[PDB]
Specification:
The complex is a heterohexamer, with 3 copies of chain A (193 residues) and 3 copies of chain B (447 residues). Chain A is an alpha+beta fold and 193 residues long. Chain A is built from 4 helices and 6 strands. Helices cover 26% and strands 36% of the residues of chain A. A 6-stranded mixed β-sheet of chain A has the order 2-1-6-5-4-3. The longest helix of chain A has 19 residues, at 27-45. Chain B has helices at residues 24-35, 120-124, 159-163, 166-176, 196-204, 209-212, 214-220, 266-284, 286-292, 338-352, 357-371, 411-424, 429-435, 439-444; strands at residues 15-17, 40-44, 53-59, 62-68, 74-78, 93-95, 98-100, 107-109, 114-116, 140-144, 147-151, 180-191, 239-243, 249-253, 295-300, 304-307, 312-320, 323-333, 382-384, 393-394, 402-404. Classes of the chains: A alpha+beta (193), B alpha+beta (447). Chain C binds chain F through residues 107, 110-111, 147-149, and chain F through 90-92, 102, 188, 190. The structure holds FE2/S2 (inorganic) cluster (3 copies) and fe (iii) ion (3 copies). The PDB classes it as oxidoreductase.
């Protein structure tokens, strides 16, 4: 579909990702994906972080959100770390964050925060090799309101890998987000995208 | 407001007017008397190691290009075209032998010189004095063990003199460890706080740790987890506080080499710093070798902070009195194994980065405290930093600087604000020196 | 699914709501819900308020939007009214609002306003008892532009009850929204979420 | 700008410079001379009835904690930690015996006293003068029939004296009805208007009702629906206007007990107020008893407004010259049946709340009028409030205050702005009194 | 469904559009539409503008985005051009814009921009006359981040006509957007809605 | 800042302090000395051709109603109710015999007169001096071949005198072509730049074209595509630059009648302008007839710009020092066929409209250059406009004004800023004239 030598703004990675969704459209898979993401957003929205972990997150998960340094489109000499990790969590690291959220002394959680997620553009495709690896792509708008007049809205595309876990439940085993905004104007990125 | 007379900071740095965190006129005045006058963190050698390598950085509200010259030096310039003032470079880092302005095509060298002007002969003929049209250059650019600072003020002290007594504390980790590198790129987040709020918090605020970060300490299982919710008190002499003439200062928590890092990194770090400490005892002495593997929360006046060992490195970039752009890098020891380095960097960002759960604990504190500074009934109120006053010493046989021989105290706040008042009421560096002739005596007054 | 004693940030109400969607996923119901909400958003967007009332709203409707007072997460003594009603309309009250919108002297309606709604995260489940009561959950982003440079964006989760009315048409019989932002930064909340 | 000399309000309050609604320097000056000087609405007994109950409230741009003491009194304090100025309380209401600062853990009592400081003995020893570190307390806190006001200025008149002639009008509903309660929590919305725009509109603007609210009147079927689009004129002597020395004022629309409420509440209300009126005739007189069930649109200077009977209660919280945070509560009579109370509250919010269709009618009016005050060619223009000038009386045998014996007029604007000019050009309360020695004569000058 | 004499705020055009979706709900068509729009948003998001043109855009396309002048709701005498065209492109005009985006001297494209689209409220209906003309309606939120701290969010409803092109691929033959915000507060509207 | 003494613009307009693009106090000062003093574009006859037709327009930050009177004249008024200052008209265009205020119903005529006040007899009786309550009227409203300008300053020169030497250049296209019409409505976009950035860019910046617009030139295939990325240089005498006493100026690119329009319109336009040019040779002369079909990038001081032939017409509406609201119309020749007119309009918007790919090229240039003007280290820096200085002539036998006989130069910047300095340091029009007695000598000083 995409020739990156012609489509000059396209990253090799992006061209790779779009190819898996263009070939096989499994209508029922897209619907499964939709359900999975809707329920996950629902649990996150009501702040059921333990339920989230228990029901949506695989034990081998990699939960990654990066922030890419701004570099020339035509830059080809400078080769130092291109991105830093806002998140790069394994299951136990998520669990640390979850406990931090539930801790009665997390003063920033009082009064209670309000989250509202909007998941769109869901695409789903089984991996070519691992027949048990489901690729799901989706975009999120995440709205967080707190303390009367604080409002932060986050925007992102999520490249996920979901796999049937124990009890046949499909769980997230990889979430990768290249956060679009280099400098955050949201106070922090302390939300689960 | 008359900054020559206005007592913004009381004698001995005991208190500050709350307005200093909200006053826009004062913010403007700081641009001149704080930021245009003092040393400001730019980057690290490890970020621009090869000729032509450059990053952009903020100095106050100004943007500058910091570029590695062919001769191995580093020069910094205003990121502003000399023609009609368009921002020259739009990326944060790269490698190049020059910068071309996208407005009319003027070409500047990595050395800041005006090198080419399109159609020069045909339009300007020989009129254009290119020699006089180089990018406005940052007067002073110096290094502290690879950490690059710049200063717009040519009259400033050399950086080492500027660091004053604080330098002795940093040297074990900055020099004797074999050197540090900065892992980029940094996280970048805007908070609605005055730059001084996080600056003062990192310079000398160990008191808030147990309470502010109760949830994080508990959750992370880090080596300081015993202080969660002020459950326990740091042992007798668990550390100290120091400050210096030009404002820099830091807290010292003995032995806390793994710092804020969650249990998953504690063993390795504690093993690494211990092994190194052992070699250093022979080279620099037991005390200094211990300082190396001791947790330093330090602010290099005015707006650069760090947590050694934890390896958090911050720049509090000023935007306005209630807005600050936080840059967060990771500092790692050059000789650490790559994988540890990588994981330390992630852990630094995990705890203090854009989504750092620890840094998040601090948000409301920094933001409301700053914002309250604008509130009518608080403007003329006094922020207190009197804790441990009358117990600090100066000229100690072992620990140099004005020093509070207690882990928790406000010694470092006093020194920070003493230097801040002096600059704000001073028109230049000589006046500052004159205003600072009795600095340590002022800081120890009842001792 | 959720243990509120463990998932400490979760309200009893929220835990209740998520349970109805997790058990039975009726794929065709979700699609009906989607259609219903899309058409309703479409009518609202073009300002066909009478059509909205006629085709989307049940005569026994309760249209409620609340604003919860900020209280300590650990507050258990203070027991005065927790929320006020931004909206708490019966069919006739909606009709008053609709007529107010269509009145030729509603000066604020000139020039004409522009609405754009984005409905996402649709979930649907029949009630356990009332086999004719459809529970629909959905999130809305509502964008309102007026007078050249005024732009207000609202964000909310909608807990709806829809029921077949006269002519078999499923109509809204209950909409409940706990508005996420305590202090509105949108001039007013004069929109139908 | 020189506020001692600047004529912001013309003689007799006939006109105001349009800049008063847009000028930021003046806004800052109001913080001192209006908000720090006068009585400001905080809350109601019904909102904090039990010991330890508290709400936060704004006073000007300041935030305060208003807490019910053990002895049944109410004290208010700046919501700001005395240590480094972090905002103490982050919720809007609750019950507690004290407040702990999340930054360093200082514990303040509901009485504002510094009660605990973590590690006090170990860190501060005996140095800390806690007695001197209580929350900055609001000097004056007084009640008007359960309605709690605060004033930062100790020199202010008692609240009753401050209400002046306006008090006589409110007493039938505030006192003689058996008492009111405020149904919380309030709606909260930010509008892009100066606080004075809605303040002046509620203080004396019946003229806009028919036209501004044409659509709402028509739609709601309320008891004033005949005025929609200025179709009809309020009968001869359908009401009046009054104002007072310290700025408060109100319009009176005879008998309009169901007020803005749509037809669905008219019968019940009209029945309720009529029955009560009948009992009151015997106790307070026919006139006053009628006032009770008459619609009062009133502003209690400077930024608290209400519509009795309709039961709308407003606080216009100032943010900046073109920003205001509107708090909307419902006032209900204590002896009304619960269900009516509940429905009156919903109806109040339905009409004047965040999505109040009536309040919405007013938005553009308040916002553009305020915003136009910043526009260069309008700054020095004159807002007119000359309607009914030369027909107001003072010292009437029946209706006290400066009184316009007409439902529609600008009498109340004149009194509001007269008091506003006096304060703005005054440095303290004595100067205000001196500037107000001939207030009513100024207001009736051509009569 | 809609009587514009009763529903006084409704434009004749709007009433026309809603009628085509209310009659026949072809569930499989809505799903095709969804896929088409999701893939198109995906290509646009990764900046595969040539792929977009090649795979999503018909050779006879009209790509139109208008900005309507604010006029009295009760205005009936003033009859000068009601709108201007922010976009009114034929295929070749889009191609000019695409080449401008890919040009190595488009300085504004360095560093690389970040786009994230959220497509919702998809409705689909075949035209009554042209059995090969698919009407698709959808709403977009378009988020564009660049140069560290620049963030622009666009909101719009898209009235599309899609038709099977060469190789049976359904392509866009008409996109019409009446942009909701009269005065743009986004620096420019240089994005493909 | 003292604008009587402050040298914001150096002698001969050679340089400007970068702060002029960021300084808010100066912006405020411009409101008075630039915008309230000079001629500002309002609309075109073609936009309000019939009696009662009106549009709103900005003048500086003020909003005005521009209305076609019954007698065929045009009067303009502040869009502000004379009662309590609510914005009178909320739409951008329409037709009406008057405007009614939605706050209290006051009815103003299209002639600005207060015509009706609800319940006038009953409320005001005979007190209301309506005659004295008309909308604040814009003192001067004049036409240049259908292009309507307004000026709040009665002392201003007639518009033709104001246009000075620039008028000669515009006349072939504005007058001799048979007339232009403006195709509305305009696009409207806010950019984060100072109004002077695009103003100076359109007044005399041909230098940036090749480089700034490299991508667009290349992509569009327009008649200037050879300059993409500064590949080629405009031939010897490919055009010129001129400027005038009151600040207006423009660049002239010979023969570029199809201008920025992509290849799809080149043939038709080049055919149209050529045919017309041929008829004009006989009427106005070869030179002037050629000017007609030559591309003029012009700014009519202070904030109205245009590209004749390309047909782009701009208003840079000032909001604050770093915010500007850009209005973009299309200018077309009245006798062009309708379909071409339609397509020229689309093409104008396509290239320079809200999504104009050309206009987009310029964004970053205008925005960062303006924003850098606020940056501490740039405030006192000098923007250079010295290109071609010492080669401009005045009083040429053929081309009037101060003229640079070169397509690319900064002649027009010099004249623009010379006039800007004069006004900013002047209190009124007489002072400006006094400050401008040697204007052309100042502009040609080394020639
Ligand atoms: S602004 Fe940089 S070349 Fe002109
Ligand atoms: S700021 Fe409150 S305890 Fe320190
Ligand atoms: S503000 Fe216009 S009539 Fe009163
Ligand atoms: Fe902290
Ligand atoms: Fe009103
Ligand atoms: Fe340009």
């Amino acid at each position: 579909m995409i020739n990156i030598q012609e489509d000059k703004l396209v990253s090799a990675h992006d061209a790779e990702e779009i190819l898996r969704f263009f070939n096989c459209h499994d209508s029922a898979l897209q619907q499964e994906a939709t359900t999975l993401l809707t329920q996950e957003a629902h649990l996150l929205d009501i702040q059921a972080y333990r339920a989230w972990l228990e029901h949506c997150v695989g034990s081998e998960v990699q939960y990654q959100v990066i922030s890419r340094e701004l570099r020339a489109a035509s830059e080809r000499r400078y080769k130092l770390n291109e991105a830093m990790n806002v998140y790069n969590e394994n299951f136990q690291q998520l669990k640390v964050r979850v406990e931090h959220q539930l801790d009665p002394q997390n003063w920033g959680n009082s009064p209670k925060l309000r989250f509202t997620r909007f998941i769109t553009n869901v695409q789903a495709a089984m991996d070519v090799n691992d027949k048990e690896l489901l690729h799901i792509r989706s975009n999120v708008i995440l709205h967080r309101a707190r303390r009367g007049n604080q409002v932060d809205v986050f925007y992102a595309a999520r490249e996920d890998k979901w796999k049937r876990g124990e009890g046949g439940v499909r769980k997230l085993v990889q979430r990768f987000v290249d956060y679009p905004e280099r400098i955050l104007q949201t106070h922090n990125l302390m939300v689960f995208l | 407001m008359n900054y020559n007379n206005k007592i913004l900071v009381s004698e001995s740095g005991l208190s500050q007017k709350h307005l200093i965190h909200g006053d826009e006129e004062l913010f403007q005045h700081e641009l001149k008397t704080i930021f245009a006058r003092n040393w400001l963190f730019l980057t690290h050698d490890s970020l621009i190691p090869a000729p032509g390598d450059y990053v952009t950085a903020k100095m106050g509200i100004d943007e500058v290009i910091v570029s590695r010259q062919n001769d191995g030096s580093i020069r910094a310039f205003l990121n502003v075209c000399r023609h009609r003032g368009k921002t020259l470079v739009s990326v944060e880092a790269g490698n190049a032998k020059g910068f071309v302005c996208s407005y009319h095509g003027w070409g500047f060298g990595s050395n800041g010189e005006l090198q080419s002007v399109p159609f020069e002969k045909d339009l300007y003929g020989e009129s254009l004095n290119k020699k006089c049209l180089g990018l406005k250059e940052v007067a002073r650019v110096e290094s502290f063990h690879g950490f690059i600072y710049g200063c717009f003020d040519q009259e400033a002290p050399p950086l080492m003199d500027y660091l004053g007594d604080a330098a002795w504390y940093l040297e074990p980790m900055f020099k004797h460890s074999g050197g540090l590198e900065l892992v980029g790129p940094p996280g970048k987040v805007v908070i609605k706080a005055n730059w001084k709020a996080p600056a003062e918090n990192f310079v000398g605020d160990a008191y808030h740790v147990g309470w502010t970060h109760a949830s994080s300490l508990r959750s992370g299982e880090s080596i300081f987890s015993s202080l969660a919710g002020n459950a326990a008190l740091p042992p007798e002499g668990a550390g100290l506080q120091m400050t210096s003439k030009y404002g820099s200062g830091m807290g010292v928590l003995w032995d806390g080499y793994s710092g804020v890092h969650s249990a998953d990194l504690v063993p390795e770090l504690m093993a690494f710093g211990g092994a190194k400490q052992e070699r250093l005892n022979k080279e620099i002495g037991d005390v200094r070798a211990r300082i190396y593997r001791s947790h330093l929360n330090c602010t290099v006046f005015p707006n650069n902070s760090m947590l050694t060992c934890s390896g958090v490195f911050k720049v509090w970039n000023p935007i306005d009195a209630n807005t600050t752009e936080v840059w967060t890098y990771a500092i790692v020891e050059k000789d650490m194994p790559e994988d540890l380095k990588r994981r330390l960097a992630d852990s630094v960002q995990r705890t203090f980065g854009p989504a750092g759960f620890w840094e998040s604990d601090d948000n409301d504190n920094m933001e409301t405290a700053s914002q309250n500074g604008k509130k009518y009934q608080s403007r003329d109120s006094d922020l207190l930093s009197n804790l441990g006053f009358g117990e600090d010493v100066y000229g100690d046989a072992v620990y140099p600087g004005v020093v509070g021989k207690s882990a928790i105290g406000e010694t470092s706040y006093r020194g920070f604000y003493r230097a801040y008042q002096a600059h704000v009421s001073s028109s230049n560096w000589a006046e500052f020196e004159h205003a600072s002739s009795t600095w340590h005596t002022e800081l120890t007054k009842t001792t």
